[PDB]
Symmetry: T
Subunit: 167 residues, 12 copies
């Protein structure tokens, strides 16, 4: 069996096409990718540069967040590839993210909790914004977005509880 | 740098709020939590007290159910936390669950199969009832419920199969 | 506690029925099962009989697809069990699948990439076709289909990429 | 070899009986079970609902306690079965435990340390109370109680040290 | 370079491997078909059993499925290593005569009987093709011994559910 | 540092003797060793030769008992070594055990449950009989017996429960 | 149902397995007795050795014990898979003639000699029963080859403690 | 909710005290701690400095002893913490241990066996001496000591056996 | 005991300083950090976007590179922290890296091999340039750089080998 | 004591093991030399391959190296267990005639050809010495079957890179 | 082949000698060993006796330090043996270490951070002092010292960050 | 992105060359490779053919040395690849090693300890001889040699210690 045998039977990538995402779908995932990638960069920045009370817990929880964002970035980027899109998470493209910035300096732990919670909440904000039209077109892509939302919001609660009083 | 620096930029928990669930959403997860917690308590009760035919399989399958329900309860409770809710699974609060009760005594294995299937189906009933309004409000929370539904119904099938005969076709 | 004790409380499979899928739902899942099982049988055929450039990578990725399809078939079949359905994946039933065939002969690796991408896409087509009415009736069953969709479409990309050149922008 | 062959040789559960615990033994273990079960329920309640300084450490240490109490509950319940007793840890039976309650609301971390230490110390109190007559009758059951005491008191120290000053 | 390699005779063409006859290959193909049929029927039963001692049987069926799947892969690849070209496509595997558990819910005790028969028919094929295979290629036969040991073990374990002391 | 250096400081096995068990203690542990070794040999016999309902669960649980008895025998024998005793678990010595025998024939699973529960209880009886004087002399040796008691009695319950019906309350 | 299964002849009764002769079964029973005797004597020595290079011998004895235990289980179950009924109760195993390390503390160098003899006597039994077993059931014999390889390996490793270069 | 709420209910460390050990109990564990800590320090000294016949076995067995003593020391120290005591295992404090000393030099393997057995037996001597009054006061603390006793005496046997001949019967 | 007790003894971070690196040392590690971080970002870009011959091997090898560079970046950043420096690997700061850029589009596998080898070699160039003055000041920091150099150059070889022919001898 | 053990005849001297002939030992020695040569050449190629589909070949060479190393150890130790004295010192292994990949960078496609030839020459040795080994010691031959299965598998996997459908 | 055959071929420990360290090298490693051993003793002392805010993080990080120092002690001691030296880390020899002491009493967590950071920094001080002449004589021994320096200084930063404000 | 795109940016192996070792460096690493490969071949010979006292410990430690030498050979050879060199470890090349030979015969364990310590020391001698010029040119390559030195010298001590008695102080 040769490439010719296969082509005449019509069992080829060109004859049997898959789901091809709309440029809207592809663009919504792209936004999520940028924000997830900025998140793990800023996350690591904070990881190294935190100082002050309850240092270790925060150092470790920032690594957990970094790990999740890295994994989710790969998942979204590859979801794009699977649906015909082309991801971009080069540093210059990622720099245009609006999730926030922890700065170049050492950061008090208490202050870092607030900044990171905001950065995570901004990344979730993007997913929730793009979710409905993605779900409408491709429910399976929205399912991936559901996993990312659950995990980020879980971590947002865990990290932020450090700075809360009872209600 | 300091907490002064962060509040001037507005990168805080107060200045940037996360998704805050309606009391309806939180109330619907609280129901699921209560029943899942009751399910694993009853599960362990039965795990210890079953007697009779095909004992070991049921002993082990009950522990598998117990483990799933424990994990799912942590998941639902923490999902509530994540959306602004405040879970309650204290024993007195869980005792108000209406899923069913295996009793305090030694229980025949065949009888236990029937009871536990009903407990699982009741817990699933709660989930399927709270589902639509939760999904309309928070699709992510409903995805969690789908995972719970899939696993519980799988277990209800595996456990119940001990007592089944081939259906009339 | 005897069987009798359990019946009089109404804690049984008979009194407390679970979700009972429509015959449409079950039929939809059965189509997906048939195509998934066809996929792993064809996958193994190819796994053995590929010859030519980048042999090892293809041999391995075909096993990864086989493993996924096998697991997903188990999941669908058991999902059917959980909802009242009776799956069939005997070889004569699976042979009616229309996803395609890799043939009885040694196959060139480049030819195999093309064919396997087609078999995978045909399997995904079935899922996408049965999806909406399944989702309407039972969102949990649709969540299983979503997991299957993500993984199959991921694999189709990875395998197919061997034969691709950058798109004309 | 059939059930009849076995019965005539006298090798049966009915002919060769094991250690049968006194209703006192069985009742002392039952008290321990209730308290261990309440402990892991309240433990999880706190696990979810803590807020404030050193959140993560406490969240994790409450899971360690929950895990130990769950295991020990199964051990005691099954020890009862092995000695002829019949355990009950249904939610309504467990609700009658007097170990204490963390309440339905969010709880400050510092406050949670105090409440949990008390809940653990109350559970240990029950074991120490029932220990002597159990040991007298069935040393092996007391040995299980020794393992539970060591572990709970270890965790009681670990959790409470958070709120201590040097002596 | 490839020409360097050709000049010293260190090639698949110059140094041929052991080549199986079409009978050796046919003997292994039969074994493959039956083993593949076995794991497909095994899974069918795994899903559809109902009744007494359900879980043990559910699990043991999966252990049989896993064994038959691995063995099928070993057999197909043995064929490949000796020049044969295996076929286990569904239509080809549907011609197996090991038996069929049907498409319906099946009583556990009935399933034990059927599956033991299916296993024993697969072992029958292996023992039938064995001697000509061992005469020609003793290493192929060693694989067959491994498959035989494991299948007959599982046949004993599964079938024991229905047995009385003799 | 030579041997001589060690002798003159009195840092030797001869100068610094350990705990030396009484002949009663050693004899008590030897009885327990004999019964434990008999237990795992009989356990394996049964493991192979059981036939009938709930075969697999019993086959597996018998291996779990075998594993436990084997480990516990090693522990007792070595406990004896640690205290000056010399254990014997050769087959001719173990054959004098009075815990019972499962016979040379295929055994019905229900008959095997009964017999094995008896063998286990007879082994526990030996431990309980030798316990108090062992505890009086050497509480550490008694703590080993406690661990053995807990596990054997746990197993007797799990195995025996197959043949039990709820007790008359 | 069970009647459904009976009508199509898919039963343990209708489809019989390979049945061993009473000689095959007797050959395996001998192997079982000796292997079981081996691990019991192995443990005895494991506890009671005293003297030079103690730890190595303590550990290697346990490795022998583990191997002989697993092999005993394989042999007993092979018997079961082919229709035999194994017996390894202590009184039955006490009739083994492989040898005995006695009930006393044993010098390590003496123990090496005794244990190697015990292993070699077990291997002797296997090689004696081999040819009639291989004639009748080549798969049974394949198990015997595995047992032989492992025991002779351990015999070499253990015995080497006492050897001089030749 | 707040720390005000907790002190009004009395659920605190101050209002509900745990078991507080007598200075005698704490003093007896402190002795065990000092000696166990000395034992692993001397153990490592010997681990590095042994020379001669059957080197590797002893090297490895010394590390096993070191590991056990380290773990047991953490156990005893933390047990003290749990009962209100305050352990001290600083080097100067541990140097007052009377269990024995392996010296600073290369040590023949046979000689090392003799010394280490004596060190282990001395550490065990401390435990057996403090035992009865600890058990009378806190049976749980004595159970810990039983575990330590069992493992140390096992190791004293395994290590010492290198130098033993069959006893005179 | 208290923080008063510790400051009178002088056992503090203020009273006993660790090695404080020169701004030159910190500046040299900062360069390495920026480039290692750029390397794994570009690595993932390529991981997703490669198309063409021997796809899977390159996909996987790029992930191995990504993993190494991530770990090494954590190592360098934390080394800076340890010597008094303050790392910066925010996206805008990393975007100033001059190692090279794989572009935003689908990239042929052969072309990707060439690009990534150059990116790796550029990152290595930075290390070898900062090395001598770092080693003169802090041999420990230079040892870290040796580990990075070894792994990166190994990967540059493995990745580049896809496109190589035997050299002219 | 050792004298106690001597009085009951439980010694390596009194109870001898299976002893291989010098031909059995010579047959295994040849297999050892070739297997050792195989893993050394395998590593050489592992380092020095250049060109298309590099990584797959790099990895599969290592899998071949690992297999040949383990098999070499099994063969040498089998010799030891039956009284032989293996030799795999570099000078001795240099006499192997399986082939040589040279000391230079080697094109991947050329390497596939060479390595398959090297594997097939090793398998050739095993099949040549097989029948006299199996006649004398069937357990030794069982080891040979394992080695044969694995090497021929790897030969197929590696060589397939260069093959066309027939 | 016998001991005699080997001796005549000259393949023996006595005929073919290895690297033999200078008493200076051996003495520099010995200093490092003492300090590493004191470090893990004091580390454990603190591990047990800490009380106060962020107890758990510090309890665990002190175990990580203890584990590293124990491993490194074994590495240095065995490096000495490999180069002809003879290590001594008996408690009385180790007591002469000047790294510092956490005392016999319970210790506030904040105070412990400062003391331990100082103890670690003092151990690193010793390694840096002895490093240059060791590196000159035996680069491989200095390489081991590089691994120990990197790890101790890493932990020194991690532990001390607890008590820092941003700069 | 095509190959062409990559060439015009100068992102290739040709435009961006890596570190290229001198022929001296490569020759130095080649000597180390030859001796390491000789070491593991001789190690295996000995592993099989040792007879006599403390057999098992020596058998095992020889495998540990073999494993180390095998891994280190791979590291050196690939280090050579990473820097432009072409390693050779074919048997005829390795046979020119001068580290020593254990012979074709059974060897007494005490004789083997002596010989293997010599082979290991000869291998270390090669490394130490080639070290300084390698370090001068490429400190990263020297760091690999340091790791090899530490482990080989560790092993020589452990193996050799079997035959040592305490030194005359
Ligand atoms: Cl990732
Ligand atoms: Cl949980
Ligand atoms: Cl599956
Ligand atoms: Cl549990
Ligand atoms: Cl498979
Ligand atoms: Cl054991
Ligand atoms: Cl076993
Ligand atoms: Cl520890
Ligand atoms: Cl990282
Ligand atoms: Cl090997
Ligand atoms: Cl250590
Ligand atoms: Cl290697
Ligand atoms: Mn913390
Ligand atoms: Mn990826
Ligand atoms: Mn979803
Ligand atoms: Mn989902
Ligand atoms: Mn949780
Ligand atoms: Mn399944
Ligand atoms: Mn349980
Ligand atoms: Mn106790
Ligand atoms: Mn105990
Ligand atoms: Mn069962
Ligand atoms: Mn395969
Ligand atoms: Mn065979
Ligand atoms: Mn043992
Ligand atoms: Mn030894
Ligand atoms: Mn078994
Ligand atoms: Mn601790
Ligand atoms: Mn980090
Ligand atoms: Mn490839
Ligand atoms: Mn070996
Ligand atoms: Mn060590
Ligand atoms: Mn270095
Ligand atoms: Mn280094
Ligand atoms: Mn390699």
């Amino acid at each position: 069996t040769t490439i010719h045998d296969v082509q005449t039977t019509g069992l080829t990538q060109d004859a049997v096409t898959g789901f091809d995402a709309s440029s809207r779908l592809n663009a919504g995932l792209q936004e999520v990718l940028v924000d997830l990638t900025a998140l793990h960069l800023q996350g690591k920045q904070a990881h190294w540069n935190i100082v002050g009370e309850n240092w270790r817990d925060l150092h470790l929880q920032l690594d957990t967040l970094v790990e999740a964002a890295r994994g989710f970035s790969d998942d979204v980027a590859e979801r794009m590839r699977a649906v015909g899109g082309v991801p971009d998470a080069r540093p210059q493209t990622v720099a245009a993210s609006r999730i926030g910035d922890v700065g170049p300096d050492e950061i008090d732990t208490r202050a870092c909790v607030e900044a990171i919670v905001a950065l995570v909440r901004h990344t979730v904000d993007t997913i929730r914004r793009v979710h409905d039209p993605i779900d409408a077109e491709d429910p399976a892509s929205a399912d991936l977005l559901h996993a990312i939302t659950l995990e980020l919001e879980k971590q947002a609660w865990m990290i932020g509880s450090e700075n809360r009083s009872p209600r």
